Amino acid sequence: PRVEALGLEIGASALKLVEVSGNPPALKALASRPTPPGLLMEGMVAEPAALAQEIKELLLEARTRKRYVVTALSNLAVILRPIQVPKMPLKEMEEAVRWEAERYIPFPIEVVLDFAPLTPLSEVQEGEQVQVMVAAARQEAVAGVLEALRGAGLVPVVLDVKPFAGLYPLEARLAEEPDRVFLVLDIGAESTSLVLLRGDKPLAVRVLTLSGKDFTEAIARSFNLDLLAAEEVKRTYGRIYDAIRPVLVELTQELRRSLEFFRIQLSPEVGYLLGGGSKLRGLASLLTDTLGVNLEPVNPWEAVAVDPKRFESEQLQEIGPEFAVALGLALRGVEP
Amino acid sequence: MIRLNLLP
Ligand SMILES: Nc1ncnc2c1ncn2[C@@H]1O[C@H](COP(=O)(O)OP(=O)(O)OP(=O)(O)O)[C@@H](O)[C@H]1O
Ligand SMILES: [Mg+2]
Numbered sequence: 185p186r187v188e189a190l191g192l193e194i195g196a197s198a199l200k201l202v203e204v205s206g207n208p209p210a211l212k213a214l215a216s217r218p219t220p221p222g223l224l225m226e227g228m229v230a231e232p233a234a235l236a237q238e239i240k241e242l243l244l245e246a247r248t249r250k251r252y253v254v255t256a257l258s259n260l261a262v263i264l265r266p267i268q269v270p271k272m273p274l275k276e277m278e279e280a281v282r283w284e285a286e287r288y289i290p291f292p293i294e295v296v297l298d299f300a301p302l303t304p305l306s307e308v309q310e311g312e313q314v315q316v317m318v319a320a321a322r323q324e325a326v327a328g329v330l331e332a333l334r335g336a337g338l339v340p341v342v343l344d345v346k347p348f349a350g351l352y353p354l355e356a357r358l359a360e361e362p363d364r365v366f367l368v369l370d371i372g373a374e375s376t377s378l379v380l381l382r383g384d385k386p387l388a389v390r391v392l393t394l395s396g397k398d399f400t401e402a403i404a405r406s407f408n409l410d411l412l413a414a415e416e417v418k419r420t421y422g423r424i425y426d427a428i429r430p431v432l433v434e435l436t437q438e439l440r441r442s443l444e445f446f447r448i449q450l451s452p453e454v455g456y457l458l459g460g461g462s463k464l465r466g467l468a469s470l471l472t473d474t475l476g477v478n479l480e481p482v483n484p485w486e487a488v489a490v491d492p493k494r495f496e497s498e499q500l501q502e503i504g505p506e507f508a509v510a511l512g513l514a515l516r517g518v519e520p
Numbered sequence: 521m522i523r524l525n526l527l528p
Contacts, residue, residue, distance in 0.1 A: 257526065298524045319524045326526060343526045355521050384521045516523070 189252035189341045191349075191513030192239070194329070196224055196258070197373030197396065197460060199235075200507060201242040202514040203250060209518055210489035211500075214507065215245035227261030227374075229328030236335025243336070253333060254342040254349075254513040259375040259391045261325035262345050263289065266302060266388070267318045270311045277316075285318050296321050302386065317386065319345055342516055346370065347377035347389045350458050352512030353484035358384040367452040367477055369439075370508070371461030373397050378439070380446050387450060390442045396461030398431050422465030436474045443475060452477040458484070458508040484508040487515065 191202040196219060203213040217238060223231045243251075265288060269280045286293050302315040326343065333340050350370050351358070358366055362383035370377045373396040380388045396418075404414035406427035417424065443452070455477045457468055462481065471479045483504045488511065490500060 262526070296526050296528060298526050300522045300524055302522075317522050317524070319526055321526050323528075326528065340527055345524055345526070348522045348524065351521065386522050 187252040189254050189517030190250050191510045191517055192253050192255040193510040193513060194255060195219060195373060198506060199238055199242060200510040201246050202510040203246055203248050204488055204514040204518055208489055209515060213246040213248055215242045217241055227258035228325055229332050232328055232331040233335050235332040239336040251338055252341050253338045254344055254517045255340060256344045256346045256349055256513060257321055257325060259346055259377055261321050263320045264345060264389050265318055266315045268313050268315055271305055271308050271314055281316060281318060285320060289320055294323050296323055296326050344513060344516060346509050347379045349512035350509045352515045353487035353508055355384045365451060365453055367455035369457050370459040371395060372459045378442050388446055392438050394435050394438055399428050402427050402431050439475055455479040456482040458505050460506040462505050481505060484511050
């Protein structure tokens with residue numbers, strides 16, 4: 185049956201939940217809890233029952249009766265890459281994808297796999313070549329998450345991938361400019377993704393290892409601080425500068441590199457920033473200057489009706505970079 | 521826009 189499902193992001197820094205509902209969709213509830221250490225390791229859920237208890241807190245905090253959910257795998261658990269295949273009937277395409285994907289997957293095809301055509305299949309004939317985006321994950325990564333959700337009393341309807349789910353609240357705005365080339369960066373705590381689009385159609389995705397944790401770890405090193413305290417220092421201050429400079433330089437290089445490899449193999453007018461790592465003070469200006477792309481924060485909540493009597497627009501805005509993904513997952517939960 | 525699902 186046709187359920188309105190919740191959006192949940194099992195983030196490495198924060199576990200975040202969003203409830204949306206109604207026919208034009210409206211925000212109903214949201215909640216965030218810091219992720220306890222040891223629960224996630226390198227994209228896997230190492231402590232699923234402990235995650236289940238954390239996710240229960242979220243459902244209590246949001247005060248929701250909903251028990252269906254869309255969530256997402258960590259970017260470190262999924263391989264995302266495009267693959268050229270001839271158009272065939274759907275069951276036949278699956279086998280072709282699985283066959284082609286086999287070469288790019290550093291473990292036994294034990295894998296869960298999905299794909300989606302980068303261009304509409306109806307616009308080409310049988311046998312012509314189409315680019316599909318393939319996603320692949322270890323069955324174990326998927327199993328850790330489903331076991332977590334089961335302990336929490338939740339039923340998953342979709343297991344999505346963050347670089348695209350983060351885009352759902354921007355999609356109507358990206359469709360306004362169907363021919364414009366846009367970049368969207370999600371700087372997380374565990375990874376940074378980049379997605380390059382034309383209008384609302386992805387052209388490429390790249391995931392970098394470098395992220396908010398790296399900035400915390402450099403502050404930590406530079407001042408023998410604990411992670412939480414280095415983290416708090418990162419938030420309030422943003423000399424800090426001297427400790428985080430090599431991270432800034434390295435992130436800037438890695439992002440110039442990715443863009444140069446996009447331009448070689450396939451280039452951004454404007455861009456958007458999401459993810460809490462994008463709020464480091466001044467980062468947006470730095471990245472604008474250094475990548476030659478006007479990069480802006482953006483408010484994901486505009487995708488949804490927000491009741492001024494229940495939420496402060498000012499507060500929503502502040503947490504919009506961290507919540508873009510959970511909001512996209514909640515939008516998916518109420519599709520179509 | 522791309523909508524994947526890696527649910528088994
Ligand atoms: N005001 C701020 N200034 C600098 N850094 C910040 C700020 N706010 C949050 N961060 C960093 O943003 C990160 C958390 O953002 P977010 O919730 O988007 O990550 P996440 O979804 O848990 O991570 P992931 O998607 O990688 O699993 C943390 O690394 C935090 O230190
Ligand atoms: Mg995130």
